[PDB]
């Protein structure tokens, strides 16, 4: 249709206004004295929340240009939460800060490209300074402490996570489920997890987590792309009876076929969910087989001349539970016989021997690790269905936090790590004055999180920021107790990874917007 | 319906405004310091791009006259990218420049026709001057260098392309595909390529490339025009089962029949794609047969009395992969027996002997070259499905760039070739003063690309243009390093063919607009 095209300054102010609505709405929740945001609902009572992510999801502006601005930072900010399980709100306020000043510099006539180079240089410097500040979290003692802090001081959760990582390694698969009632349970079962999310939402039957959860599902492994959902009918009808859900793992499920699956499972007849087969090329055909052996299923490939129409329930794999993400699939408790599974592991281990390459070797180790490693299942304690669901949530978060802390350590939270790191880059310079301004723009922005947290407390940002900058190390301002001291000792910290991702992702979208000269959108008509 | 008719000056200003929106939106992306353009989407997050072609595609104006302006240059500019795989943006800014000044001259009372003759004369001169400036790219060493530069300094890609051209000649068919995993692969298989595109989009299942891609497809060769899609049913049903895609190569597939194919393949039942048979007249019937022999299929012609209803899967040809373009079809790895294919080649080679003409001889050689030459298949390396798809893209582009460089060489990029070529035509004159103005209009426009690139860098066009013009040869301004020197040595170049096509296509639409006196469009009512 006819488009409305805006340029330079007009385009920029629109974007600025858009992110201001977004950031302003979200940042009120930041910190221990964060404020409530009321989100309306089509039917029922409004939602009262302090969850920056929830607020962000609801933001959509009437002005198309302003909206594009909001959707952009809204998008990369979420990339942060995906990468470290936290930091979107931080990323969002950081983006507003960089963009606001960056745009001012532009209107003052400074070079957008040099401004961006400066911001980027400052960010790189900052991330290194961040690694330096970082404290390791490698032993179970630390793993437990972090988990406890994440679970809101629940030593139980900390203990659980530490035991779970001790069982499958700190890089092993760990899932959480509702318990059988009072008292937690930790079990390691035959399972696996690969990087492939659902082939479309709608499959999502747990919107709170935006995940797909199937119980006692059959698993169809098809080494091909599915176009005509007719091929499926005979098998789907079989799965229809038996009343069990079905997970389709194919090379791909195309539009119409996928549509059919969504519609039909939504009508109650047959519960299905599909995801692409892991990897590509030859390591794909191999992995597809691993899953088969693990779940006691039979891969259906056209090469050998097999047909889907002739596939019976007996060809299908089986597991007690599968969980699908926006980009992850994890199979829990596969039926596959230990004899076959363990034997399969043996075959892959010889492959590693006959391996005439390091790459080919690393890929084979990855496979056995999955097949041999299993999956740690944490079953959250209980005493009332309500408390049980609430604890399960804290555990899930504590888990993501601990996982990140194990990967890159921790740093002083409450936004002091960022302000501390910036205080050290006071002499960082670029190739020209514009680049220097860019550097100052970024360093100044790194104070946004702390300042906002302080503002929410009803205190004076300038003063607290001034004091925190005056000291060093992990000396900061505890917004909760409203007292200064060592942030780590006071147990107020963030995984170095979450702070890093928040900053890099913010700096990214900010850099893009500052270097935007034209915007195109449909006419409001 | 009732039309709105505009004349002379009114019509002209409308067109000018239209192309100004187009060019202004697109040119911000030009050069290494190009800016981002944000393109909105009906659902999701906006698209942030520096791809002038993507921006151009989204441009549609509300004012019908202004829109016609944009659509016209938008159209011929795209012809450039089609001819050399690059240059649309350049062509677009070149068109804005010629049109802007050209229209000024018109309003000043100068003769439109003479102005156009002058522009054209200057362009012809410039293209010759461009050939002179051109550096050959005939040996594999050069072929590799160019490909490496195109692949963004990836010697691997350069090497691959050079090896591929060494296998099938620099005028031979070369295709790229996803690899089997890590490490590239180069293979020559039985294949062919002719000048016939898809009989309609929709068939396109790879919008990124605007191409149709079928895997392990059957191939129906019918020496007739298809009207009643009923004739097909028996065969389509056969192809329906077997679950394989079908390529229809007929004299033509008419509206309704074509409509049916699109609809049904879009519903998952049977994947089809159709294209016209290559060539015309008698050399058509022959070529149709070559494809048959190459793919092991049987041509179905009415002359011999064959019917489509009685055609079985066994009559259909077969190949591992076919790729259809906006105007090209390439068959990869045909099943045809080497005995039959090689024997067929023999028959054509005797034809060349018994040839009592040079034309008839050239045509026969073309056929054997196709049938005997085969097709070089580059399978892009890997290590993660993402990197693999990204490298495959760089290879595909590097390929187009190298192909063009092999045809007409290379010249100093960064827009300096054009400004250099113009600096030499300072004495070019026409038959009258209007024509002289036309010449100066074109020569002045040839500076648009460089000037725009410099402006995006935040520098002063007048000065850089002034300096580049002051020197000679391939002495230019490296916008990346923002330093002067030899453009070729610094590895900043464009295939002579892309610069030539951009200029000629720009000059074409500009000449047409300058000589437009009346515009007719539907009433906004």
């Amino acid at each position: 249709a006819a488009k409305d095209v805006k340029f330079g300054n007009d385009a920029r102010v629109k974007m600025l206004r858009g992110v201001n609505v977004l950031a302003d709405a979200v940042k009120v929740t930041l910190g221990p004295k964060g404020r409530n945001v009321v989100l309306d609902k089509s039917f029922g009572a409004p939602t009262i929340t302090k969850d920056g992510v929830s607020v962000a999801r609801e933001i959509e502006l009437e002005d198309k240009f302003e909206n594009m601005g909001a959707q952009m930072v809204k998008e990369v900010a979420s990339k942060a939460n995906d990468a470290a399980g936290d930091g979107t709100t931080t990323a969002t306020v950081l983006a507003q800060a960089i963009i606001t000043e960056g745009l001012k510099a532009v209107a003052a006539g400074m070079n957008p490209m040099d401004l961006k180079r400066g911001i980027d240089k400052a960010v790189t410097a900052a991330v290194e300074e961040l690694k330096a500040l970082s404290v390791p979290c490698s032993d179970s003692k630390a793993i437990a402490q972090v988990g406890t802090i994440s679970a809101n001081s629940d030593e139980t959760v900390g203990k659980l996570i530490a035991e779970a990582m001790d069982k499958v390694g700190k890089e092993g698969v760990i899932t959480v489920e509702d318990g059988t009632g009072l008292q937690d349970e930790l079990d390691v079962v035959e399972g696996m997890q690969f990087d492939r999310g659902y082939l479309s939402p709608y499959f999502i039957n747990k919107p709170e987590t935006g995940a797909v959860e199937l119980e006692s599902p059959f698993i169809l492994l098809a080494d091909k792309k599915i176009s005509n959902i007719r091929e499926m009918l005979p098998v789907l009808e079989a799965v229809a009876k038996a009343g069990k859900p079905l997970l389709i793992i194919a090379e791909d499920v195309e539009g119409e076929a996928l549509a059919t699956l969504v519609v039909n499972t939504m009508r109650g007849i047959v519960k299905v969910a599909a995801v692409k087969a892991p990897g590509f090329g030859d390591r794909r055909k191999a992995m597809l087989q691993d899953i088969a052996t693990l779940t006691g299923g039979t891969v259906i490939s056209e090469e050998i001349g097999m047909e889907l129409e002739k596939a019976t329930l007996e060809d299908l794999g089986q597991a007690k539970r599968v969980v699908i993400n926006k980009d992850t699939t994890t199979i829990i408790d596969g039926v596959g016989e230990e004899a076959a599974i363990q034997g399969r592991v043996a075959q892959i281990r010889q492959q590693i021997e006959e391996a005439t390459s390091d790459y080919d070797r690393e890929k084979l180790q990855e496979r056995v690790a999955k097949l041999a490693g299993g999956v740690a299942v944490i079953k959250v304690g209980a005493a009332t269905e309500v408390e049980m669901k609430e604890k399960k949530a804290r555990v899930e978060d504590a888990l993501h936090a601990t996982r990140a802390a194990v990967e890159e350590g921790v740093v002083a939270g409450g936004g002091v790590a960022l302000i501390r790191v910036a205080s050290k880059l006071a002499d960082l310079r670029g190739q020209n004055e514009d680049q220097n301004v860019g550097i100052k723009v970024a360093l100044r922005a790194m104070e946004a999180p702390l300042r906002q947290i302080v503002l929410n407390c009803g205190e004076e940002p300038s003063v607290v920021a001034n004091t925190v900058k005056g000291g060093d190390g992990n000396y900061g301002y505890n917004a909760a107790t409203e007292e200064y001291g060592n942030m780590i000792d006071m147990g107020i910290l963030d995984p170095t990874k979450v702070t890093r991702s928040a900053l890099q992702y913010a700096a990214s979208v900010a850099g893009l917007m500052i270097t935007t000269e034209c915007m195109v959108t449909d006419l409001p008509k | 319906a009732a039309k709105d008719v505009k004349f002379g000056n009114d019509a002209r200003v409308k067109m000018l405004r239209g192309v100004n929106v187009l060019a202004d939106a697109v040119k911000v992306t030009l050069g290494p310091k190009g800016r981002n353009v944000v393109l909105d989407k009906s659902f999701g997050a906006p698209t942030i791009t520096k791809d002038g072609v993507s921006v151009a595609r989204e441009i549609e104006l509300e004012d019908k006259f202004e829109n016609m302006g944009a659509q016209m240059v938008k159209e011929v500019a795209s012809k450039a990218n089609d001819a050399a795989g690059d240059g649309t943006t350049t062509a677009t800014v070149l068109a804005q420049a010629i049109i802007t000044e050209g229209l000024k001259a018109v309003a000043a009372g100068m003769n439109p026709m003479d102005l156009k003759r002058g522009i054209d004369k200057a362009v012809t001169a410039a293209v010759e001057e461009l050939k002179a400036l051109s550096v050959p790219c005939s040996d594999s060493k050069a072929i590799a260098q160019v490909g490496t530069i195109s692949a963004n300094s990836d010697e691997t890609v350069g090497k691959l392309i050079a090896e591929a051209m060494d296998k099938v000649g620099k005028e031979g068919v070369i295709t790229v595909e996803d690899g089997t995993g890590l490490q590239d692969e180069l293979d020559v298989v039985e294949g062919m390529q002719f000048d016939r595109g898809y009989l309609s989009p929709y068939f396109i299942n790879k919008p990124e490339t605007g191409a149709v891609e079928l895997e392990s497809p059957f191939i129906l060769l019918a020496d007739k025009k298809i009207s009643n899609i009923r004739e097909m049913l028996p065969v389509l049903e056969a192809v329906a089962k077997a679950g394989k895609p079908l390529l229809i190569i007929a004299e033509d597939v008419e509206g309704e029949a074509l409509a049916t194919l699109v609809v049904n393949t879009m519903r998952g039942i049977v994947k089809v794609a159709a294209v016209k048979a290559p060539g015309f007249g008698d050399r058509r019937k022959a070529m149709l047969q070559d494809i048959a022999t190459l793919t092991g299929g049987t041509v179905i012609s009415e002359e011999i009395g064959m019917e489509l209803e009685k055609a079985t899967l066994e009559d259909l040809g077969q190949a591992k992969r076919v790729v259809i373009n906006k105007d090209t079809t390439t068959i990869i790895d045909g099943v045809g027996e080497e005995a039959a294919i090689q024997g067929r080649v023999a028959q054509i080679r005797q034809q060349i002997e018994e040839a009592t003409s040079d034309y008839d001889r050239e045509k026969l050689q073309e056929r054997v070259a196709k049938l005997a030459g085969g097709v070089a298949v580059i399978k892009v390396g890997a290590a993660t499905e993402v990197e693999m798809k990204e490298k495959k893209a760089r290879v595909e582009d590097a390929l187009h760039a190298t192909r063009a460089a092999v045809e007409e060489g290379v010249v100093a990029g960064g827009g300096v070739a054009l400004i250099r070529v113009a600096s030499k035509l300072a004495d070019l004159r026409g038959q009258n003063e209007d024509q002289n103005v036309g010449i100066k209009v074109a020569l002045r426009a040839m500076e648009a690309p460089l000037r725009q690139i410099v402006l995006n860098c935040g520098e002063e066009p007048s000065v850089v243009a002034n300096t580049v013009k002051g020197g000679d040869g391939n002495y230019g301004y490296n916008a990346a390093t923002e330093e002067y020197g030899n453009m070729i040595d610094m590895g900043i170049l464009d295939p002579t063919k892309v610069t030539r096509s951009a200029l000629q296509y720009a000059a074409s639409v500009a000449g047409l607009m300058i000589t437009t006196e009346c515009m007719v469009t539907d009433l906004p009512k």
């Binding site: 007719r230 789907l236 009808e237 059919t260 039909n264 009508r267 007849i269 | -």
Partner: peptide, 12 residues
């Protein structure tokens, strides 16, 4: 446009 199997599956 679509059809329904005896068991209720809606499909093209």
């Amino acid at each position: 446009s679509w059809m329904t199997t005896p068991w209720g599956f809606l499909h093209p």
